[PDB]
């Protein structure tokens, strides 16, 4: 039962989902491609045409490319309880659902670093670090910090 | 994602639907050998030794008239 449902709701994104990892980074790094390698299906049966949106600018830290906006609301859920500022909101209506400010304005507010670590798939992504390296290349070393006190 | 990739033309199910045309034409081409075979052909033991006597004593015989000649 768990197994086809796991199956079943990772078939429905994949099939509503864009095409284009070789091209999104995160690819290599996210969930839902992880997600779907160790738990859903290995052949997609879909031809239709798919849906697409326009991408969305967010100030010179995070650049949205909203095709892959999956409808988390994480990224709802955090500007609106840890970060304080009340910008970015869901709006619209079934497979036309999508997350942007309406006025085309920015977030000026701390923590959207975090609000690109938040969003799983590979959507809001740091624009400093557009296409510079996937993430198997690069050795990590843990330190702390010293801007900040 | 098979359906018409592999072939879209005219099928009513998804079954009988491709062409292939991969391997062997009717029949195998052929039986095929692999076991050896040389023919033994040749003037076996009395042609040849004869060949060889009767040579040799003829080829004497005509060294004996040269050298007739020759003294
Ligand atoms: S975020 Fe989605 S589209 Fe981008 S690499 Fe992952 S699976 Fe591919
Ligand atoms: S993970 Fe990111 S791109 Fe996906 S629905 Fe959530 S906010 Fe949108």
Known sequence: ?149 | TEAYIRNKPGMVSVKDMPVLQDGPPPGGFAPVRFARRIPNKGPSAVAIFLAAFGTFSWGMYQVGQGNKIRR
């Open chain 1, 1 to 149: 039962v768990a197994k086809k449902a796991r199956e079943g709701v990772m078939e429905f994104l994949l099939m509503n989902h864009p095409l284009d990892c070789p091209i999104c980074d995160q690819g290599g790094e996210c969930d839902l491609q992880d997600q779907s390698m160790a738990f859903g299906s290995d052949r997609g049966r879909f031809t239709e045409v798919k849906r697409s949106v326009v991408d969305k600018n967010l100030g010179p830290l995070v650049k949205t490319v909203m095709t892959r906006c999956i409808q988390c609301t994480r990224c709802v859920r955090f500007a609106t309880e840890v970060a304080g500022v009340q910008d970015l909101g869901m709006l619209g209506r079934g497979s036309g659902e999508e997350i942007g400010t309406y006025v085309e304005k920015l977030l000026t507010s701390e923590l959207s670093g975090n609000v690109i670590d938040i969003c799983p798939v590979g959507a809001l992504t740091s624009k400093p670090f557009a296409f510079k390296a996937r993430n198997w290349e690069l050795k990590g070393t843990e330190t702390i910090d010293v801007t900040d006190a």
